[PDB]
């Protein structure tokens, strides 16, 4: 089976993606995106760029992730969807922002749309107040 996989579904991709971030594997995380895949932050500090189109555009902005954040996530609680290519999950992250030393305690609801095991849209909701607390 791991040598004879069908394409990951959206639940599987979200869980795997979070492990990659825990590992600091920014390249592996970006690899999960379709070449035209999109990452969005609906809630973000003002002045930030909040939509990134294309896997390699995402990479251009992700390379140094492990040098900025170490993070651990709780188990994802999924809502049951009609389509396996849509996942909506809630989870919590605890980490340390490296440059400020600030603690990050973040609460997420992620909406992922996928196709053939690749991410088309990662819509990454989180609390911008908590993110600003970590950064300061
Ligand atoms: Mg919008």
CATH number of the domain at 103, please.
3.10.450.50
Domain total in the chain? 1
User: Under DSSP, is residue 50 helix (H, G, I), strand (E, B) or coil?
Assistant: coil
> Please, which residues bridge with residue 21 across strands?
none
Reported resolution in A?
A: 1.5
What is the Å distance from ligand 1's center to 123 Cα?
A: 10
Spatial distance between the Cα atoms of 53 and 73, rounded to a whole number of angstroms: 25
Distance separating alpha carbons of residues 52 and 30, to the nearest angstrom:
12
Q: Give the Cα separation of 58 and 27 in Å (integer).
A: 10
User: What's the 112 CA to ligand 1 centre distance in angstroms?
Assistant: 15
Write out the H or E segment, with its range, that includes residue 45: none
CA of 97 to the centre of ligand 1 (A): 27
Length of the chain: 136
| d(C-alpha 34, C-alpha 64), whole Å | 21
Q: Residue 127 carries which DSSP code?
A: -
- CA 42 to centroid of ligand 1, rounded, Å: 6
**The Cα angle at residue 41 between residues 118 and 86, in degrees rounded to 5:** 35
**Structural domain for 43, as ranges:** 1-136
């Amino acid at each position: 089976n791991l040598y004879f996989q069908g394409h990951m579904n959206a639940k599987e991709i979200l869980v795997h993606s979070l492990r990659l971030l825990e590992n600091g594997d920014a390249r592996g995380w970006c690899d999960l995106f379709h070449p035209e895949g999109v990452l969005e932050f609906p809630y973000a500090p003002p002045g930030w760029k909040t939509r990134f189109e294309g896997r390699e555009t995402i990479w251009a902005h992700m390379r140094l992730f492990p040098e900025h954040l170490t993070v651990r996530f709780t188990d994802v609680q999924f809502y049951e969807t009609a389509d396996p290519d849509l996942a909506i999950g809630e989870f919590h992250g605890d980490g340390v922002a490296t440059v400020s030393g600030g603690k990050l305690a973040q609460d997420y609801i992620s909406v992922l749309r996928t196709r053939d095991g690749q991410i088309l849209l990662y819509r990454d909701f989180w609390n911008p107040l908590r993110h600003l607390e970590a950064l300061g």
